[PDB]
Each structure stands twice: as C-alpha cells, then as structure tokens.
C-alpha cells in the first residue's frame, strides 16, 4: 500500500484503541479492513487471526504491525466476485425463476447460512428492494451489494 493510503489506515487504526497504547481488539480487524476497500470474510480473517472463539475474540489484541500485515495478507486477493458471479449468486432467491427475489427468504439465508447475520444485518441489506408482494429485482440487488 502507498504511504498515503496507509496514513489513512494509520488513523483508521489509531482511532480504534483501548488502554491508549497502539492496541486494537481482534474484533475490529475485519470491519476496519472492510472500510479500507476490502470485504474480508470472517472465515478469511479467522485464518489470519488464528481461530479465536467469542471470548478471546473479544479479548485478544492487535497492534499496528499485526494489523497492517493482516490487511495486506487478505488484500492481495484470490476469488472476489463480479456481476456475473453475483447475479447467479443472487438469482439465489428466485422462487420459480422469476428475475425477482424472495422477501422473507433473503432475510432467512442471511440468518441461516455460514456467516450468520443478525436480524439487524439481514434487514438492512434487504429492506425496500422488494415490491408489494415482496419480490426483489436481484439484477439490481447485485449491483447494490457490489458497489457501495
């Protein structure tokens, strides 16, 4: 990364502290990273954190040359998707095959699959991209997730 954007990252680190000495909680790693032009899966991060459970996930600490290498060690990346991948991967609620997507079910997948979203996380991604019957045009729901 250039020193420029890394300075912005130095701040996005610096802000997020606890005892006042260059110390970020493991928890915050992916989220800060996400804002920093990245969407690293919890599974991706968990690899480069060393499999904590909720306890030491909440308790263990990062510092900057643990954070910034992690950022990088995901950032140069492998599979990360595009429109064509995500129209199929968001035709993912087509109910008959309809070019529009299932309202409750888009919420449920988000609770029910891998990286279990809260209710909160589910509703926010979905809401108001359905119609009266609760059909979501995914062809657009795709671009919404893929840019913003």
């Amino acid at each position: 990364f250039s020193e420029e954007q890394t300075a912005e990252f130095k701040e996005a680190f610096q802000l997020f502290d606890r005892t006042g000495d260059g110390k970020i909680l493991y928890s915050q790693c992916g989220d800060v990273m996400r804002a920093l032009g990245q969407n690293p899966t919890n599974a991706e991060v968990m690899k480069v954190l060393g499999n904590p459970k909720s306890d030491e996930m909440n308790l263990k600490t990062l510092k900057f040359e643990q954070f910034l290498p992690m950022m990088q060690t995901i950032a140069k990346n492998k599979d990360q998707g595009c429109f064509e991948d995500y129209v199929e991967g968001l035709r993912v609620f087509d109910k008959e095959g309809n070019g529009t997507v299932m309202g409750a079910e888009i919420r449920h997948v988000l609770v029910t699959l891998g990286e279990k979203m809260t209710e909160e996380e589910v509703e926010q991604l979905v809401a108001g991209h359905e119609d009266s019957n609760g059909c979501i045009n995914y062809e657009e729901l795709v671009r919404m997730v893929l840019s913003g």
């Binding site: 250039s2 020193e3 300075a7 900057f64």
Partner: protein
C-alpha cells in the same frame, strides 16, 4: 538502487512504485537496508 533504476529507467511496466517494489523484492533482508515507515503509498526507502 541505481542498477534496478537503470533497468527500471529503460522500462514501460515500471512505475516509481515498482521501483520501490523491485527494491523490496531484491534487497529486503540486507543488513544496511530498511523499508519505509509503512508509507508504501508514498513509496520511499530508509537505508544505512
């Protein structure tokens, strides 16, 4: 530095960026060389 930059001077795929990337690439671990204070973004190198 100079030699990588002579080669890099004669080079289209080569950005002042990839000059410092080629310097990290070739030197790195040398007991007289040092990277930037994380400023890859500014692309700079600290040397003994």
């Amino acid at each position: 530095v100079l030699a990588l930059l002579d080669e890099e001077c004669w080079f289209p795929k080569a950005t002042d960026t990839s000059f410092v990337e080629k310097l990290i690439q070739e030197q790195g671990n040398h007991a007289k060389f040092q990277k930037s204070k994380q400023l890859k973004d500014k692309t700079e190198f600290c040397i003994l």
